[PDB]
Design a protein around this ligand. Structure first.
Ligand SMILES: C/C(=N/O)c1cccc(C(C)(C)NC(=O)Nc2ccc(Cl)c(-c3nc(C(F)(F)F)cs3)c2)c1
Ligand SMILES: C/C(=N/O)c1cccc(C(C)(C)NC(=O)Nc2ccc(Cl)c(-c3nc(C(F)(F)F)cs3)c2)c1
Ligand SMILES: C/C(=N/O)c1cccc(C(C)(C)NC(=O)Nc2ccc(Cl)c(-c3nc(C(F)(F)F)cs3)c2)c1
Ligand SMILES: C/C(=N/O)c1cccc(C(C)(C)NC(=O)Nc2ccc(Cl)c(-c3nc(C(F)(F)F)cs3)c2)c1
Ligand SMILES: O=c1[nH]cnc2c1ncn2[C@@H]1O[C@H](COP(=O)(O)O)[C@@H](O)[C@H]1O
Ligand SMILES: O=c1[nH]cnc2c1ncn2[C@@H]1O[C@H](COP(=O)(O)O)[C@@H](O)[C@H]1O
Ligand SMILES: O=c1[nH]cnc2c1ncn2[C@@H]1O[C@H](COP(=O)(O)O)[C@@H](O)[C@H]1O
Ligand SMILES: O=c1[nH]cnc2c1ncn2[C@@H]1O[C@H](COP(=O)(O)O)[C@@H](O)[C@H]1O
Ligand SMILES: [K+]
Ligand SMILES: [K+]
Ligand SMILES: [K+]
Ligand SMILES: [K+]
Lengths: 347, 347, 347, 346
């Protein structure tokens, strides 16, 4: 049966569907965008800044936390430098902060230094979360810190979600290949369309009461609404936060216009800092302070929740209905046959 | 339970996904009847309505539209007294037909009072989400005060939303969520329904109530109008195909030696200056007098009805058959492998 | 009742949607026979007909096409006496077979009388909608006056229309509504059927009466012609691939130091001068003598018949099997990921 | 009659239509084995073959390919003795493996005689249509004269064509009609089968006889190679990804300010001096070892995601998931300006 079912499975991505409007008794200004990942970790907005060397550092995680979100300090630095940055964030009013940790031999010594800075969640993020080495590390970390929030990823199947939950992780991160700087699906030929991956993983984690994180693939505020409506509790962003003033990336000039360096953790340049690469090096347009971008994201989420009549996010993921779409409909969803003179804050 | 499992079941079709199949014909395009009835007090010689936008329809536009057999909708982005005078200006010019857009805002009741005293033929209660409870309650409020008034309500995209507006008092339902050429709702909120599916679904519900529907937005060629009418719509509402017309309120400007007219969305930042925007500002080529483009639109409709053998518009929507098509069929339907030297009036 | 529910059931396929599947072959491309028979009085050495357009086929084109084993169609954009002289000129110059297009006007009989006295080999009653009652009555009228004349009727795209023309008196049916490279019928009227589905459906009906069908329009490569013949068509009609030929009526024009020839549709505004157009005016690159492009066309057919093992065209249309493909497969079928250095005769 | 109604029933899938599904893995990419066996006399350390073209594979290319664990195919666009000199020149250094292409012609047997006397390890009977009767009769003719020779026959794309070559005498089947980057067969003749379906269809038939299949043409990224092997192919044959390499026969030219190498199809008008190929240029990519390292490294990454301990576990257990064009846009880098050209992505 394994030979005959090679090409049976089918996947859906963000640009394949649309959210169906339903009866609404709530106004967009009145909806609540709050979400809870655990009793020790509660966010006012479902936005997380990814743990990359060009997205989130001490300055970024602070600005993200002041807005109700969460920042993830990347692991491409020394153990003592990462612990001080976590302490620097917590010093600004005891905000919420996370830190990425790789499945290395010295991971436990890195994790020990982070908990003494009272980090709120660690992220055991790797390219393949369904690996045996990743599962054993989760059992190893959970045994030493029973009350710590453990985020494990990345995965894209329901079987991989269940395996990490049984290893000790209470938060599962979903996404293999949808990143804007990712080339895994081109280099390794491996991947699962995000919207299907989120739906499959959230279905498995929902019967255990485990939240899932939609990580990667979001390029517009509407895609964030689709990810949350597919079963995800929160969304993790990289490209939409890289052009923010608070991000660590370096400023470069292109065509007389400011840009910010945005690289993947699998790029050759990010590798030296930390055999074949699975990411590319690039630049994103400068978008100014973080607060401007966040208002457009939440404002786009409030509009979508108003169309579906969802007062809270849990009503959205439990009731929102999609409609499948062709390629010609995607051009219909975007502005067409009109010369765009002014570029909108959201577009 | 069942709402979670039916997340990705529905399928949607747009204009560029299908084609009308030719059938037995005993009528020539010059002989068909393009007359349509929206109510016993509202009858149009051609099934064309100009949308109520600050860059499409004003007093001058509504006059030329009505003298051509169509209908104009005066936009609401002006004072109540300025809008009532424009309505009177049209009526005074030979007893033509004119409509006016009205929001579910607080000045709707006082605005409708001034419009009905100006002998307006129809009001349009159009909002971003016509399936809202606030919109439904206003329709009951307006219908209770004006039992014989023509009320156009929208916008909707599901059959259940059509039933709700019909049950509230509206005798014409406007269909369209996201297909506007200047619309960004599907990018910002992730919400929308493909037009051809939306029209078919809404018209199916309103057909058992004897209620006509308006295909609003999405039309970029005259053939798109024929598909909308054959899909179940009684009339079609156009915006982008009328903005570059001399009778539109915008003024003609030059960019790169070519004539253009400003075309903005009602949800764009510019229209509201007069939370998160859902429209953009753009440019359309100047198309000369209104009579030129209307002659091309109706002439394209007469040709399409000749191919289908439709003597009436009722025969078209009750008998016309579609055929689904791929993306490669879309490129074959448009001119291909020929460099175009002369720009056609319809193309 | 039932016509409303079957509105979007049908599916159509175009040229770039499929590929011919290789089969067991015992014949070499140099050995296959490309001869086809349309009637006892009309037999072609090659299955190529030049369309009857004022920028494709005139006396010079019909002569060169007939000396190559094909057939030319003199267009009808001239006087009855002008067209009869062109037909006579071809037969006096050595043209073996020649045809002439005739419109469904009141003076059609007077035009046909002059053509048969010029010893025309086939008349073409080509209109936009061959399933019209006026066209059917004209076919019955011509068959009653000339029982032995070769009558080509079109254009149609359904099996229902094919039976009507065959029962009216036509022994050759021409298929194609909307696939022309200069055609805008599907954009202006919204009416059309994908060529490969139309040919297959029409050939299915004409096969039960022993009637050949003509695949007219849509062909842009030699592979598309093989697909048209394998779908059930006896011969193929070309327009854009012959417009840049030296024997075409157009005169060579130069743009940016490169030679061009005018190629316009019969529904374009310019053609009609000599008000709702269904065609556009354009230019195609000059390709030199006709024999060069015909050599590439026939050579491409011989290769395809070799891949399928078809010794005859009748074996090809009766046995060849297709395989359906997505848009990503089309990108593979064309040269990709390599910069093309020289202009190939085929590509 | 029954052939008429099943004209448009079949469906085909290509590389960019699917993705490999990640599975449980207990192995790292550095630990997997990429070795494959085509016959008792033919074993390769890597599943890479350089195609037999006059702008891809020559003596130097076959040496570097063999020293890297792969296999080179000396093309036939040269004299019989010059091709035999190339085969011996390869065997002279390190006693490495080498192959040679042979066309179906009346003088084919004499070309094969010179190659076997040069101790060629496998001959490749490459044609446009491997399901032709003339090709099958040649396979029977060569097998009758050489019982111990490794015979690679192609190209095919259907299960019946695979079965015909196996029963004709070929122990390796070559799959691919129309997917070449320089190929225009599907545009000129309208004939072809999407590679991934063709490989799956051919491998299903060749699996019942213990016969390996070669995924020939269409690969443009390392992920396409991983998909081809997981679909049933034992090895992959490449042309465009090896043509811009320093060991390829072309010399470096500057066109539009960039270094390029000539890459032409065997059916193009230039090689034949009705074409079914075009002449083109690919960027210069330097030494072969760099491009081979990127290809194999991508295979190890893919095999790590699937939990494939060996290549035989990959082709027997890897599962695909189908995707639309919008999912294809998500698979590539998107909405980001690319400043640096990656070794595996360009
Ligand atoms: C037509 C249209 N297309 O975008 C549009 C026109 C003008 C302004 C807007 C803006 C940009 C302001 N966007 C929304 O108004 N977005 C939105 C999103 C979701 C809901 Cl649920 C609602 C509702 N509005 C009401 C009303 F107050 F009208 F009664 C009840 S519910 C509204 C949109
Ligand atoms: C081939 C073609 N493709 O568009 C074409 C060629 C020349 C002119 C036209 C124009 C632009 C004039 N377009 C129509 O003629 N369009 C049209 C549309 C629908 C019908 Cl039903 C009919 C009919 N004409 C007749 C006739 F008078 F011939 F008897 C009977 S029914 C005609 C089209
Ligand atoms: C590989 C390849 N790909 O296109 C190719 C390589 C070189 C030349 C050609 C040319 C341009 C010459 N094209 C054909 O050779 N095209 C073709 C088309 C259909 C058939 Cl059925 C056959 C046959 N070959 C044989 C042989 F005996 F040689 F094997 C018997 S029949 C051949 C193609
Ligand atoms: C997140 C991410 N996305 O691409 C990424 C980040 C940094 C580096 C890489 C590179 C480019 C180095 N690529 C792989 O790391 N590729 C890869 C491919 C296949 C497997 Cl099976 C594994 C595994 N690593 C482990 C470990 F335990 F070491 F963490 C268990 S399994 C890893 C990828
Ligand atoms: O270099 C890499 N290779 C593959 N995936 C990456 C790489 N770097 C970051 N990612 C993933 O991409 C996500 C964010 O991508 P984005 O928000 O879509 O641009 C991260 O949270 C990671 O899961
Ligand atoms: O700014 C806006 N955002 C979203 N939809 C709009 C906006 N302004 C107008 N519309 C709708 O889009 C239609 C325009 O259709 P179109 O120009 O023919 O594509 C209008 O008639 C309204 O129904
Ligand atoms: O102006 C027109 N409008 C629509 N169809 C046309 C027009 N002129 C010619 N045709 C048809 O479209 C075909 C175009 O052939 P092509 O250029 O090979 O695609 C002709 O052979 C006619 O059957
Ligand atoms: O000119 C030709 N016409 C058709 N196919 C060719 C031609 N030359 C090479 N090929 C095929 O294309 C393959 C390599 O193409 P690639 O995908 O660019 O690596 C070869 O192994 C052949 O099967
Ligand atoms: K839109
Ligand atoms: K067309
Ligand atoms: K190709
Ligand atoms: K990607």
């Amino acid at each position: 049966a394994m030979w005959e079912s090679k090409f049976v499975k089918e996947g859906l991505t963000f640009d394949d569907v649309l959210l169906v409007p339903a009866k609404s008794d709530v106004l967009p200004r009145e909806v609540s965008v709050k979400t809870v990942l655990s009793e020790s970790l509660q966010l006012n907005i479902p936005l997380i800044s990814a743990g990359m060397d060009t997205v989130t550092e001490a300055d970024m995680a602070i600005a993200m936390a002041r807005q109700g979100g969460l920042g993830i300090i990347h692991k491409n630095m020394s153990i003592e430098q990462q612990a001080e940055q976590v302490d620097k964030v917590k010093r600004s009013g005891g905000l919420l902060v996370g830190a990425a940790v790789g499945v290395t031999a010295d991971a436990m010594t890195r994790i020990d230094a982070l908990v003494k800075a009272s980090v709120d969640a660690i992220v055991l993020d790797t390219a393949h979360g369904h690996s045996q080495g990743v599962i054993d590390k989760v059992k190893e970390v959970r045994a030493k810190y029973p009350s710590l929030n453990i985020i494990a990823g990345n995965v894209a199947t329901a079987e991989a979600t269940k395996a990490l939950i049984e290893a000790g992780a209470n938060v599962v991160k979903v996404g293999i290949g949808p990143g804007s700087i990712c080339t895994t699906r081109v280099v390794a030929g491996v991947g699962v369309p995000q919207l299907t991956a989120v739906y499959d993983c959230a279905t498995e984690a929902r019967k255990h009461g485990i939240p899932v994180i939609a990580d990667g693939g979001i390029k517009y505020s509407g895609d964030m609404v689709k990810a949350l409506a597919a079963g995800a509790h929160v969304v993790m962003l990289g490209s939409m936060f890289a052009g923010v003033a608070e991000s660590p990336g370096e400023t470069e000039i292109y065509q007389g216009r400011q840009f910010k360096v945005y690289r993947g953790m699998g790029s050759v340049g990010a590798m030296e800092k930390g055999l074949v690469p699975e990411g590319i090096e690039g630049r994103v347009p400068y978008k100014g302070p973080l607060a401007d971008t966040v208002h457009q994201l939440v404002g786009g989420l409030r509009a979508g929740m108003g169309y579906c009549g969802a007062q809270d996010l849990e009503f959205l993921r439990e009731n929102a209905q999609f409609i499948r779409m062709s390629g010609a409909g995607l051009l219909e969803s975007h502005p067409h046959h009109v010369q765009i003179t002014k570029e909108a804050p959201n577009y």
